Copies of this chain bind each other. A is one copy, B any other.
């Protein structure tokens, strides 16, 4: 009811996602995905039975760990809703088919599923089952994909049952390509390629960007979900500060497991010699602002408010030092 009221902001940057998590019984992923699907008419377009959508979303959400401070169902819901907003930027108006829109939203929803709260490097260094399965390459991201797709096979969970086989083939490839690109070790190459696309950009009269081949279109979707993954410092400060508390809690719990094991403590994971505030300013200066600056160019001017909130938040964090 109040939940129904908060969801009216589903198209707005800065949605009250923690409120929605509280008001939904810890089901923000299920309710925000359901709303975005209904909003985008995806159940009818792709003949998804609503009970099958709900069943899948709840199983998916159940496989996000509730005892993981950052990489949980609330972050999944947040990346979903963030991608949903960026898909509707005027400078991308219907650039993407309904299948490409389903792909980016579905990939956003599964992109961190069953995250254990430790980094790929930790999984490699502890000789984990996951790193052994995936040969040290994008270990978490390959696992998120495999779980997200595997859950489609549970009873009444195949939300793609009424897609054609080639639609399913095309959707599967796009989702894999998008989620594998969320690995932060791919950030720099992803950004180089986004910059290249900016300096050779092409525009219609009303403003809609022109992408002709799959290669460029998937690359925009990869950077879009990557931006949505890295969108915490662009949200209203009250939201950003809670994201920061959660990621630092997750880092410190990793550094405690590293200390326990007598492993070398990873950067920013030592709760005894951290500077949360200077780390966020560095995060913004070196990762988040270069990314959102290049994205704002690509969709000029639709991202100016987003970029404005980011620069305000960087100035504030700097002022706490």
User: Residues of A at under 8 Å CB distance from B?
Assistant: 132-137, 142, 145-146, 149-150, 172-173, 176, 180
Contact = CB atoms under 8 A, between A and B. Distances in A.
A interface secondary structure, majority: helix
A138 B315 CA distance: 46
Given A134-B134, A136-B172, 11 more contacts: A132-B149, A132-B150, A133-B146, A134-B146, A135-B142, A135-B145, A135-B146, A135-B176, A135-B180, A136-B176, A137-B176
A142 B146 contact: no
Nearest to A180: B135
Q: 6 smallest A-B Cβ distances: which pairs?
A: A135-B176, A135-B145, A133-B146, A135-B142, A132-B149, A132-B150
A133 B133 CA distance: 9
17 contacts: A132-B146, A132-B149, A132-B150, A133-B133, A133-B146, A134-B134, A134-B142, A134-B146, A135-B142, A135-B145, A135-B146, A135-B176, A135-B180, A136-B172, A136-B173, A136-B176, A137-B176
A253 to B, nearest CB: 25
A63 B21 CA distance: 48
A133 B139 CA distance: 11
The CB with the most chain B CB atoms within 10 A, among A134, A135, A137, A149, is that of A135
Contacts of A180: 135
A187 B276 CA distance: 47
A197 to B, nearest CB: 23
A176 B149 CA distance: 25
Contacts of A137: 176
A291 to B, nearest CB: 24
A268 B173 CA distance: 26
Contacts of A134: 134, 142, 146
A150 B132 CA distance: 7
Contacts of A149: 132
Nearest to A142: B135
Contacts of A135: 142, 145-146, 176, 180
A133 B134 CA distance: 9
A36 to B, nearest CB: 24
A157 to B, nearest CB: 14
Contacts of A172: 136
Contacts of A142: 134-135
Contacts of A136: 172-173, 176
A146 B145 CA distance: 18
A266 B132 CA distance: 32
A179 to B, nearest CB: 8
